[PDB]
Design a binder for this molecule. Structure first.
Ligand code: SF4
Ligand code: SF4
Lengths: 150, 200
């Protein structure tokens, strides 16, 4: 029931549309207005769209929601462009836990990570195909030998 | 070339003067030849007395690769920290030397106290002993002392000390030489690229 609800699979279609049933399933009833995703839809691009909305609808009051959601959008865009680097899914999961209930000032972000955590839970393979490049945030400064962390 | 007259240490006669020899009243070609001969013998016969202090003495012995008496020495190299308990000793040894005498300060400590601005250290030997050449470094490379000796030779070849203690002016005229820093400013500033600190 909404863009801020956790995705469920075909197995959860036999669950009654009640607040307790969907909650135990691992999501929320929300507005009870469900949306169906077909096999021709990529989960990474779908969640990227969801995050782009949740990220720009932020009011900018608390850091977790104001600076954390924009990070996820960039990771998801990199994954859908095949430019993902190792550690991206872990950051996404850490964001989902640290933008959860209680951490943010209101429930915009707690509900914004609900679709993301679910997509990684049931369709991780789609998020993994994105990581195709080695991790690198540093260029090579000439004259300075780099600290080779192993 | 201007000269500094030390007629007859922290406070003493230091009048800036003109080449006493060039002055016509005391201008004699023979006297000039005599001055040059004495300066030549002194600059080419600088016997040293290395007062070993702290770690600089170790670099000095590497350069060495002896006037054990201050009496036979013409140069006292202060190489080390001027500790409070050592300062009286340094002054006594320098005061047991005969004219002409020179002093080269080797090391940041002997130069100004260096990294040891502490209660037990004199901030520079130039606080009690007149110095002629200062060698920056900690410790200064053995080759740096050799450069200092060559700089002293040049300064000694331009001095106008009394030719005899019974006649003439008994004044030590030391030339106001050009600072080495300004002399080699051009080449230093021209430097553009250097080897990356990545290779041996
Ligand atoms: S979680 Fe709520 S209060 Fe915090 S930035 Fe988002 S909209 Fe603003
Ligand atoms: S200047 Fe440096 S190396 Fe030389 S004696 Fe002092 S501390 Fe030691």
């Amino acid at each position: 029931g909404g863009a801020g609800t956790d995705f469920l699979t075909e197995a959860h279609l036999d669950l009654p549309m009640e607040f307790e049933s969907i909650g135990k399933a691992g999501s929320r009833l929300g507005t009870a207005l469900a949306m169906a995703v077909d096999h021709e839809i990529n989960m990474v691009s779908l969640v990227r769209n969801l995050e782009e909305f949740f990220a720009r609808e932020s009011c900018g009051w608390c850091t977790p929601c104001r600076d954390g959601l924009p990070w996820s959008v960039k990771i998801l865009r990199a994954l859908e462009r095949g430019e993902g680097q190792p550690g991206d899914i872990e950051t996404l999961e850490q964001l989902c836990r640290f933008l959860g209930p209680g951490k943010t000032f209101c429930a915009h972000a707690p509900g914004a990570v609900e679709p993301l955590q679910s997509a990684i839970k049931y369709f991780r393979e789609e998020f993994e195909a994105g990581i195709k490049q080695p991790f690198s945030n540093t260029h090579l400064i000439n004259g300075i030998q780099p600290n080779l962390l192993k | 070339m201007d000269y500094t007259l030390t007629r007859i240490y922290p406070l003493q006669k230091q009048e800036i003067v003109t080449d006493p020899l060039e002055q016509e009243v005391n201008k004699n070609v023979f006297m000039g030849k005599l001055n040059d001969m004495v300066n030549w013998g002194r600059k080419n016969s600088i016997w040293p007395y290395n007062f070993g202090l702290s770690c600089c003495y170790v670099e000095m012995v590497t350069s060495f690769t002896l006037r054990a008496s201050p009496r036979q020495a013409d140069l006292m190299v202060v190489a080390g920290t001027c500790f409070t308990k050592m300062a009286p000793v340094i002054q006594r040894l320098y005061d047991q030397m005969l004219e002409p005498k020179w002093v080269i300060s080797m090391g940041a400590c002997a130069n100004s106290g260096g990294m040891y601005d502490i209660y037990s250290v004199v901030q520079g030997v130039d606080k009690f002993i007149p110095v002629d050449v200062y060698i920056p470094g900690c410790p200064p490379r053995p080759e740096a002392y050799m450069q200092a000796l060559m700089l002293l030779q040049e300064s000694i070849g331009k001095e106008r000390r009394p030719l005899s203690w019974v006649v003439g002016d008994q004044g030590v005229y030391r030339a106001n030489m050009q600072s080495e820093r300004e002399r080699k400013r051009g080449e230093r500033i021209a430097v553009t690229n250097l080897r990356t600190p990545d290779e041996i």
